[PDB]
PDB file of C-alpha atoms and ligand atoms in Angstrom:
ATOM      1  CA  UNK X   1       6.642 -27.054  -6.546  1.00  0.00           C
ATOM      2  CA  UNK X   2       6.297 -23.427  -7.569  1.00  0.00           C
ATOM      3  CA  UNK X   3       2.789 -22.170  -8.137  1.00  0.00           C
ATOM      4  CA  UNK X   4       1.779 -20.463 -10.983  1.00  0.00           C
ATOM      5  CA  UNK X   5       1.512 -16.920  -8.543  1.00  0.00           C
ATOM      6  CA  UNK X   6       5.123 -17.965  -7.671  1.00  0.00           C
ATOM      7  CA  UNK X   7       6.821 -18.083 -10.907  1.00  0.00           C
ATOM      8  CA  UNK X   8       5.277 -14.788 -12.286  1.00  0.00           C
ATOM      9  CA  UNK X   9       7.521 -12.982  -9.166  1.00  0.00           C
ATOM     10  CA  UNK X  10      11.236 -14.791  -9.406  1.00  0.00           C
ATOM     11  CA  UNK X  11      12.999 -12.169 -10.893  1.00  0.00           C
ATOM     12  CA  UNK X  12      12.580  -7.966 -11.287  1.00  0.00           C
ATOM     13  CA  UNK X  13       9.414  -7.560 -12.147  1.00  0.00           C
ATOM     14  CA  UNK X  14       8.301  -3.344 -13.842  1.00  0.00           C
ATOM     15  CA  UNK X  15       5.704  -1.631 -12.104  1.00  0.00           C
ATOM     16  CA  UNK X  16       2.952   0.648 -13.039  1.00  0.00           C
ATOM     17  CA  UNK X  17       0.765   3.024 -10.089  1.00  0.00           C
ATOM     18  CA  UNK X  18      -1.876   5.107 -11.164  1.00  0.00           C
ATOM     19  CA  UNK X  19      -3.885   6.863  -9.049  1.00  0.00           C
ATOM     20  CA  UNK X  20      -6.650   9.202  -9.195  1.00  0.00           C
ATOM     21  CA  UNK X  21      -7.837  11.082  -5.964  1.00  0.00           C
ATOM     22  CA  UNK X  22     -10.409  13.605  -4.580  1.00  0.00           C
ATOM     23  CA  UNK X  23      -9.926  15.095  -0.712  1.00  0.00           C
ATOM     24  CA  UNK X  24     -12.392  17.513   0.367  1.00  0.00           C
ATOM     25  CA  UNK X  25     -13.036  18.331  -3.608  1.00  0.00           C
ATOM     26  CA  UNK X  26      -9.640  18.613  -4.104  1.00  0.00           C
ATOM     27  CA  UNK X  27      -8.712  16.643  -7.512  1.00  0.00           C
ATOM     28  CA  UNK X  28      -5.545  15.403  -8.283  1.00  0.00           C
ATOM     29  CA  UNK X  29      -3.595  12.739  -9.790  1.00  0.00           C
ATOM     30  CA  UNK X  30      -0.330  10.366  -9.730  1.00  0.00           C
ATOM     31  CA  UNK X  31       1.552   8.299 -11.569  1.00  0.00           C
ATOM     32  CA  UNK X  32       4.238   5.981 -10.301  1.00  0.00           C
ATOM     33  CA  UNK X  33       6.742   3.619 -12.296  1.00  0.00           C
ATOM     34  CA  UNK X  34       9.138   1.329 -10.520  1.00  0.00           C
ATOM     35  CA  UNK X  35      10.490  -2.492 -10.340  1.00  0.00           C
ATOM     36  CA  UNK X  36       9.518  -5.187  -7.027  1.00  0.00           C
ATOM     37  CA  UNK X  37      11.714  -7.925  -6.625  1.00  0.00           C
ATOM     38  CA  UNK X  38       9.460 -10.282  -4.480  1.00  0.00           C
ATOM     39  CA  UNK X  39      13.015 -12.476  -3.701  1.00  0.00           C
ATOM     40  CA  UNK X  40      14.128 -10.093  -1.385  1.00  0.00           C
ATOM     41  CA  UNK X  41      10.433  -8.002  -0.592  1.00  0.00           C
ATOM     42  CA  UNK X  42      11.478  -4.967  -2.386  1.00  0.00           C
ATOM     43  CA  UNK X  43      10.069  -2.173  -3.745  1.00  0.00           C
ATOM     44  CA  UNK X  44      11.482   1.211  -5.426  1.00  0.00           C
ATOM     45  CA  UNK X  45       9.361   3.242  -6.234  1.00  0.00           C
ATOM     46  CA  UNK X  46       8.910   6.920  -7.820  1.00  0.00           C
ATOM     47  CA  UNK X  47       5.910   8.631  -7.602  1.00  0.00           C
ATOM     48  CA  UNK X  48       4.623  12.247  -9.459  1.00  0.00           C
ATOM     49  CA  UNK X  49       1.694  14.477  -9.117  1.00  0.00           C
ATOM     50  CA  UNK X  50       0.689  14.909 -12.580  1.00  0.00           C
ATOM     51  CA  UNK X  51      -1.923  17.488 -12.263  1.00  0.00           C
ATOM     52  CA  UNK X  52       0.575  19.879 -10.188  1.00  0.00           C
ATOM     53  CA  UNK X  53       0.850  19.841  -6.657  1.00  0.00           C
ATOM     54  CA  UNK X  54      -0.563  17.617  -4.339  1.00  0.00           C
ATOM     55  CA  UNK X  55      -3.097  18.596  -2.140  1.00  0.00           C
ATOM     56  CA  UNK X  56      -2.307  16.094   0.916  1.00  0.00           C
ATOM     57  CA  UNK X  57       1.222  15.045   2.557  1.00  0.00           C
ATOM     58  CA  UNK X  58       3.211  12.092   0.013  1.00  0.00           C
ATOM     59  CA  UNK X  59       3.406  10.081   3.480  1.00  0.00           C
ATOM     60  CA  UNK X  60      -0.116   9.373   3.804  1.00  0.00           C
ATOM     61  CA  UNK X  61      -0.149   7.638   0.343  1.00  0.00           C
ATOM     62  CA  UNK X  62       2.495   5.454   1.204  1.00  0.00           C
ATOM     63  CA  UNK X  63       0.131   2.349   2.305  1.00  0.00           C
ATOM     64  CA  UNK X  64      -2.375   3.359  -0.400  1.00  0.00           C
ATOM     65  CA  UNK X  65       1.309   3.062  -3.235  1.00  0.00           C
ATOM     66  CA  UNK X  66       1.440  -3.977  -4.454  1.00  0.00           C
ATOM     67  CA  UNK X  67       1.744  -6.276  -1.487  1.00  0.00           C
ATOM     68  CA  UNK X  68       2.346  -9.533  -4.024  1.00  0.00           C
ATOM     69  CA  UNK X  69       5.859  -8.512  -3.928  1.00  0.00           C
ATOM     70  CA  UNK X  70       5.863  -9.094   0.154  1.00  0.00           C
ATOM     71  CA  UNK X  71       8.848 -11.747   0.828  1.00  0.00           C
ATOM     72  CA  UNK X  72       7.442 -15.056   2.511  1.00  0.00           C
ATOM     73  CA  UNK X  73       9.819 -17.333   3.876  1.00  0.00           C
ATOM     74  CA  UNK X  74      10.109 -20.654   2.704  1.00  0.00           C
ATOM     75  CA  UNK X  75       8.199 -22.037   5.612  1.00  0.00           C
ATOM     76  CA  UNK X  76       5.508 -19.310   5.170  1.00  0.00           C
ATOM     77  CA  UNK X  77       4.607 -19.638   1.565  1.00  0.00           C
ATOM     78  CA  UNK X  78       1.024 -21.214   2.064  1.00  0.00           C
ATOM     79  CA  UNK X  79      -0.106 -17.780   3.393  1.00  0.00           C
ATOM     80  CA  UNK X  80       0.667 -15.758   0.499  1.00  0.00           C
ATOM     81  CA  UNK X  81      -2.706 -15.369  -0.884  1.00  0.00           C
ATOM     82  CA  UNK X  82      -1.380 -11.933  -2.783  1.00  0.00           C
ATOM     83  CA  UNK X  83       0.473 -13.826  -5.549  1.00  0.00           C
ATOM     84  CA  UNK X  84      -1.612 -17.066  -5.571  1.00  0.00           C
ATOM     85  CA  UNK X  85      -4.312 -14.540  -6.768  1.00  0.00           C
ATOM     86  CA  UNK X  86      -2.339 -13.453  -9.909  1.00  0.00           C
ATOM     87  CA  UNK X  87      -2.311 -13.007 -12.563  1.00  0.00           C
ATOM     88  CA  UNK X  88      -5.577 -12.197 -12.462  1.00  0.00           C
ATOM     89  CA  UNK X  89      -5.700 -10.194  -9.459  1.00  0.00           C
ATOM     90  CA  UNK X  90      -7.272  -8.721  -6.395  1.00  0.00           C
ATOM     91  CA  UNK X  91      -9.204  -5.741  -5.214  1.00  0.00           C
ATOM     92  CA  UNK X  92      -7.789  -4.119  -2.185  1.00  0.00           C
ATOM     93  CA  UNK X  93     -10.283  -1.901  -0.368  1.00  0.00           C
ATOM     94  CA  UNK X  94      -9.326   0.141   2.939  1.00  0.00           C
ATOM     95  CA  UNK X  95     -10.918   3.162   4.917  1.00  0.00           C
ATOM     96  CA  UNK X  96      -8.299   4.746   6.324  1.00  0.00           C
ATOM     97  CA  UNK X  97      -9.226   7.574   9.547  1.00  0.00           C
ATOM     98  CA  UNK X  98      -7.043  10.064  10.486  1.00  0.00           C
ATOM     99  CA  UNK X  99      -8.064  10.896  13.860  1.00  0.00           C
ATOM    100  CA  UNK X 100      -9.279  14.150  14.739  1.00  0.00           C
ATOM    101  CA  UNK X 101      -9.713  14.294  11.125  1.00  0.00           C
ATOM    102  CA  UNK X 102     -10.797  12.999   8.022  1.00  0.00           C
ATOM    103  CA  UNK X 103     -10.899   9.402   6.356  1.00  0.00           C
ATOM    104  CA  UNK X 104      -9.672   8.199   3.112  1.00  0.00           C
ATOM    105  CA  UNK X 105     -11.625   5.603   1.410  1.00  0.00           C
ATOM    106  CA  UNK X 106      -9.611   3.614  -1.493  1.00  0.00           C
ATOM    107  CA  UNK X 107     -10.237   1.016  -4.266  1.00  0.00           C
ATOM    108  CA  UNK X 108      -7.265  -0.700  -5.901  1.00  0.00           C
ATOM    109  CA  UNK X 109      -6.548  -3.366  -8.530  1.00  0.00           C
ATOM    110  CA  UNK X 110      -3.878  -4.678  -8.341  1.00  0.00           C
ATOM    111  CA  UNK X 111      -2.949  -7.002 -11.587  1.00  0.00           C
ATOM    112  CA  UNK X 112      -0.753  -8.321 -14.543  1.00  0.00           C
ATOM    113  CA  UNK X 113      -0.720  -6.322 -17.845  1.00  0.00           C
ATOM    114  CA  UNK X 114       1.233  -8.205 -19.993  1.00  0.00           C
ATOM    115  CA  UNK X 115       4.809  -8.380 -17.777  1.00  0.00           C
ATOM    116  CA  UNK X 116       4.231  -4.855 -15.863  1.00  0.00           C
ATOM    117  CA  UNK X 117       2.236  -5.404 -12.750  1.00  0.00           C
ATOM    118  CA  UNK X 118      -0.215  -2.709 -12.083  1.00  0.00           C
ATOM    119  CA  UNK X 119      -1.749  -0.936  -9.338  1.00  0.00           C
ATOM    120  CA  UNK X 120      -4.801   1.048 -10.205  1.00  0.00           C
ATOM    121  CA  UNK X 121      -6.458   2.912  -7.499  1.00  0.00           C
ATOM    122  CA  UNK X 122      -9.711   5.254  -6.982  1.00  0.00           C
ATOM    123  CA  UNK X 123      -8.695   7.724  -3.783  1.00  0.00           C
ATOM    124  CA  UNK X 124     -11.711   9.632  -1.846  1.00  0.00           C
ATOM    125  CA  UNK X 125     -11.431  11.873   0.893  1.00  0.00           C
ATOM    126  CA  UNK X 126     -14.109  13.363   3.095  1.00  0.00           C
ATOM    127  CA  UNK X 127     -14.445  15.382   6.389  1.00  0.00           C
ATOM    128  CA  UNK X 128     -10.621  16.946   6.322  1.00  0.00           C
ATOM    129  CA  UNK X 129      -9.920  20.263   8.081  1.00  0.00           C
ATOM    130  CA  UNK X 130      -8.723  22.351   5.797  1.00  0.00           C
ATOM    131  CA  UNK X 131      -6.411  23.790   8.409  1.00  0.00           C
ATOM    132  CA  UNK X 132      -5.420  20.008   9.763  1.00  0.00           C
ATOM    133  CA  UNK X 133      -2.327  18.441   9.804  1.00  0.00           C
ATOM    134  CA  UNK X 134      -3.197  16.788   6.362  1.00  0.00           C
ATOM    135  CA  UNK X 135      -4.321  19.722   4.095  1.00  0.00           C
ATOM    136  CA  UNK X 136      -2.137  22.048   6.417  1.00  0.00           C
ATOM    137  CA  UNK X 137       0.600  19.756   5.324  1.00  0.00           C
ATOM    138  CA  UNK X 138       2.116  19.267   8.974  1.00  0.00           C
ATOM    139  CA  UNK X 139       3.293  15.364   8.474  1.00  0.00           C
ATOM    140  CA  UNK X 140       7.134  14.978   8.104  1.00  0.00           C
ATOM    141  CA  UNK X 141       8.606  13.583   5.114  1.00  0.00           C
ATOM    142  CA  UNK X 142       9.237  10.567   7.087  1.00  0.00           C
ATOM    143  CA  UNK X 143       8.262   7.113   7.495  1.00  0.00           C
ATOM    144  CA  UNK X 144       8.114   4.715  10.367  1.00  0.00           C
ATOM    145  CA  UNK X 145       7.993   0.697  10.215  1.00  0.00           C
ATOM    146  CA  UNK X 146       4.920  -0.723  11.221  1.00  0.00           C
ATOM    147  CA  UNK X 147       4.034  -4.703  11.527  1.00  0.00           C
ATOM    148  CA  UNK X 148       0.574  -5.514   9.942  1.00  0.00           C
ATOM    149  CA  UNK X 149      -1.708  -8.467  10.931  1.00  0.00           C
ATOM    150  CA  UNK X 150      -3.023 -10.165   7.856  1.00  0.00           C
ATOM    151  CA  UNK X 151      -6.339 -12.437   8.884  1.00  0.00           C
ATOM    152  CA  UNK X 152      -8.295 -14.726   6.210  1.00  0.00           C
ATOM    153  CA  UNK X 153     -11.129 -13.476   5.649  1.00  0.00           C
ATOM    154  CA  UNK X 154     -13.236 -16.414   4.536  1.00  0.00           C
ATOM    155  CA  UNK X 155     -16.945 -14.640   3.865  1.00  0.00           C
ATOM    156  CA  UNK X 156     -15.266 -12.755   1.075  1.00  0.00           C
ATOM    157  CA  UNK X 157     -12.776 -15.681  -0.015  1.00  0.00           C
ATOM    158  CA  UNK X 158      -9.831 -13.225   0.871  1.00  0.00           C
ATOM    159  CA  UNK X 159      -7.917 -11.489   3.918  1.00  0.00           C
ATOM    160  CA  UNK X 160      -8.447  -8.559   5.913  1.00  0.00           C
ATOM    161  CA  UNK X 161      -6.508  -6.564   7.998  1.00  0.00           C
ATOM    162  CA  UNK X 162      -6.514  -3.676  10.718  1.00  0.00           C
ATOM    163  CA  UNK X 163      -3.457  -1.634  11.441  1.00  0.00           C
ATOM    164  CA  UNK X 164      -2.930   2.485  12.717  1.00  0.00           C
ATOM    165  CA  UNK X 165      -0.055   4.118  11.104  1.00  0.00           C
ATOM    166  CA  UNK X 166       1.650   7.131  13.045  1.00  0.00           C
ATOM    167  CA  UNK X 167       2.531   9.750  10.617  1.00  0.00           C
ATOM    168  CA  UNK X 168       4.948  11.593  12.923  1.00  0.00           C
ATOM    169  CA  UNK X 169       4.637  15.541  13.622  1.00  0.00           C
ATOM    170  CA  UNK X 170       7.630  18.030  14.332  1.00  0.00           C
ATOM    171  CA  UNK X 171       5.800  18.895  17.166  1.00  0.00           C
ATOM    172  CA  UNK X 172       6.867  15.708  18.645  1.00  0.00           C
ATOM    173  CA  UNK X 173       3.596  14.398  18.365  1.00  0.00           C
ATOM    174  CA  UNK X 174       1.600  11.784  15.627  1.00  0.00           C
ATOM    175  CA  UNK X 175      -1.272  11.873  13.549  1.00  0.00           C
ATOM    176  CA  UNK X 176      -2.644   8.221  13.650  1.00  0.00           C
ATOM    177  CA  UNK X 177      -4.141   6.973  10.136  1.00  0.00           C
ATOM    178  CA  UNK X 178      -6.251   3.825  11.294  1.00  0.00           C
ATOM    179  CA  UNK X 179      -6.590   1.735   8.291  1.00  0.00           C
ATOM    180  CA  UNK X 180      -9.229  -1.286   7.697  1.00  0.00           C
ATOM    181  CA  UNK X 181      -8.498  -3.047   4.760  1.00  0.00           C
ATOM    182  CA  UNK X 182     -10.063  -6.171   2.689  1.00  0.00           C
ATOM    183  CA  UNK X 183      -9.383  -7.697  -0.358  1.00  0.00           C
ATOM    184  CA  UNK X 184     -10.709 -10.011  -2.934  1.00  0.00           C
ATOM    185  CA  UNK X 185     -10.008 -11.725  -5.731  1.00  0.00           C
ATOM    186  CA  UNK X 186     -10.725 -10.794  -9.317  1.00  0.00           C
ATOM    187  CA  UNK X 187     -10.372 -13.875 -10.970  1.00  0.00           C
ATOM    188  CA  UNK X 188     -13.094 -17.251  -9.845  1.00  0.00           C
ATOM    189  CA  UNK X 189      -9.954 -19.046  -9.465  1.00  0.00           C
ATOM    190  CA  UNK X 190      -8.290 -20.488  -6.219  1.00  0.00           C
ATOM    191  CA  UNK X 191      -6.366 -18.439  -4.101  1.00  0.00           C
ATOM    192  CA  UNK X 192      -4.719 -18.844  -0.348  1.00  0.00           C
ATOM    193  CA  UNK X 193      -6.620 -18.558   2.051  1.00  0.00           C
ATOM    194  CA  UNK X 194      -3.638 -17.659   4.843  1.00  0.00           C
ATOM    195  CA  UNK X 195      -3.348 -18.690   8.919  1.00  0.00           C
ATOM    196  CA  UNK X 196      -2.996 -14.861  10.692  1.00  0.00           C
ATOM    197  CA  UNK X 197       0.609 -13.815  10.307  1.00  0.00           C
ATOM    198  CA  UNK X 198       2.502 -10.509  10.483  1.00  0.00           C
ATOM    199  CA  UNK X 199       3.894  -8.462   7.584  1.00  0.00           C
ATOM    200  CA  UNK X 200       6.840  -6.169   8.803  1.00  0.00           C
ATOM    201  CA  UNK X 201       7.384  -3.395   6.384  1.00  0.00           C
ATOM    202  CA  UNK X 202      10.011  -0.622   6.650  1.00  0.00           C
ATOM    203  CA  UNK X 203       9.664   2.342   4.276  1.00  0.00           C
ATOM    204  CA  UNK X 204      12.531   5.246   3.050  1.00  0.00           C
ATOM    205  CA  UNK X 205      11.226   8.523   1.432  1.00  0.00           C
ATOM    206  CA  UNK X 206      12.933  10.446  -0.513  1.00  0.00           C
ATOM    207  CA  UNK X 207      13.268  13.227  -3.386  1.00  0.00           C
ATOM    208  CA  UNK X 208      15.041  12.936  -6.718  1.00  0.00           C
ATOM    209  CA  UNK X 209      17.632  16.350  -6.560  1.00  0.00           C
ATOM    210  CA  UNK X 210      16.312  16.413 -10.358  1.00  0.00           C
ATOM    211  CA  UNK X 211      13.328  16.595 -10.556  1.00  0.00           C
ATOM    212  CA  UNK X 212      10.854  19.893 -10.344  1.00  0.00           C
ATOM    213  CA  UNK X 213       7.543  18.014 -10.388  1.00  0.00           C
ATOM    214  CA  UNK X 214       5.971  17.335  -7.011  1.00  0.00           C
ATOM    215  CA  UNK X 215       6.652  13.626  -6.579  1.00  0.00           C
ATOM    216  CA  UNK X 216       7.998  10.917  -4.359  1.00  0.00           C
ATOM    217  CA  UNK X 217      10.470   8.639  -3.954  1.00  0.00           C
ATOM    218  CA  UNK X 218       9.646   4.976  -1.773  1.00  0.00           C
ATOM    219  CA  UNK X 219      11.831   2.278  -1.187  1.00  0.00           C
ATOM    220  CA  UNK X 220      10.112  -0.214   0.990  1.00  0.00           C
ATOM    221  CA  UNK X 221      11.010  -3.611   1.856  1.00  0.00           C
ATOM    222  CA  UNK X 222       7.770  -6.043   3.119  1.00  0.00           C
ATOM    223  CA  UNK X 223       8.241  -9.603   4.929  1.00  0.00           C
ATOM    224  CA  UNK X 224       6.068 -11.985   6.397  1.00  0.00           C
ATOM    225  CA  UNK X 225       6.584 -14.184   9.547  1.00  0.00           C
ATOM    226  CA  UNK X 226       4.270 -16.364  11.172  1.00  0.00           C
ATOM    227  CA  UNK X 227       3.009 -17.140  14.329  1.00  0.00           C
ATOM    228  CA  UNK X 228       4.703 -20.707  15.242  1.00  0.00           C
ATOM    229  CA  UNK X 229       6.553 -20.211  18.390  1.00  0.00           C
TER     230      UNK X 229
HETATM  231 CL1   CL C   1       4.840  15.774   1.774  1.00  0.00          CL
HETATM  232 CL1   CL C   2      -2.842  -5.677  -0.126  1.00  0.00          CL
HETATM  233 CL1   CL C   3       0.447  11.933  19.946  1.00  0.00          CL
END
């Protein structure tokens, strides 16, 4: 049968990002608007800086920019705790450290409002160098894939997951952003709890030739596989 999560994802769903953000003091804000089609684990995405120009490089916001639209395979769909939370929800939570660097701390909730799903996040950052490859702006506009192990995390009645991103420099080098992540649900109701399996993302970046606001655009597709071999 298809769950109540399940149905709420079978076609194009809109999406809604708002975030709000502080590194090192610095304030600033985004918006995002978009459609996921969980069918196919896609997501397009634009994002713009709505109080000007942001302060940090538009990759390392990718991860932080809805994981309920993640494709799970037929044989994988009792470890998609993401959309058996909606639509109520859940809370992700990650600290993410840049080496040599600082560390972003986030808060997002990610729910229903009315047919739009939303992603609502809190951003802090702490510890950058202001002359670093984030607030020096030394990332390139660039995006590699990355597989992510999703665990249950049964204290906290959700998952959990550590994974280090490598934001690539022209230098030839990376900056690694090591994220930890957990996340609840808001509702009291039942979720899945999931066996460890992988999520395999792959993420394009872009710009709209349009547009004169500081902004971003992501397409990003997201798909689980398990670990039965
Ligand atoms: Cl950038
Ligand atoms: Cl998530
Ligand atoms: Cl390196």
């Amino acid at each position: 049968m298809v769950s109540k999560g399940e149905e709420l994802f079978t076609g194009v769903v809109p999406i809604l990002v708002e975030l709000d953000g502080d590194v090192n003091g610095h304030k600033f804000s985004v918006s995002g608007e978009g459609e996921g089609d969980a069918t196919y684990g896609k997501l397009t995405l634009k994002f713009i800086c709505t109080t000007g120009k942001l302060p940090v490089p538009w990759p390392t916001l990718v991860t932080t920019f809805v994981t309920c639209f993640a494709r799970y395979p037929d044989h994988m769909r009792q470890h998609d705790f993401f959309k058996s939370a909606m639509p109520e929800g859940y809370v992700q939570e990650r600290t993410i450290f840049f080496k040599d660097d600082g560390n972003y701390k986030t808060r997002a909730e990610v729910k229903f409002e009315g047919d739009t799903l939303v992603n609502r996040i809190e951003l802090k950052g702490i510890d950058f160098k202001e002359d670093g490859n984030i607030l020096g702006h030394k990332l390139e506009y660039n995006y590699n894939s990355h597989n992510v192990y999703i665990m249950a995390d049964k204290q906290k009645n959700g998952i959990k997951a550590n994974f280090k991103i490598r934001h690539n420099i022209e230098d030839g080098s990376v900056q690694l952003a090591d994220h930890y992540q957990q996340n609840t649900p808001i509702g009291d109701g039942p979720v899945l709890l999931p066996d460890n399996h992988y999520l395999s993302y792959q993420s394009a970046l872009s710009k709209d030739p349009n547009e004169k606001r500081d902004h971003m655009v992501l397409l990003e597709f997201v798909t689980a596989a398990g670990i039965t071999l």
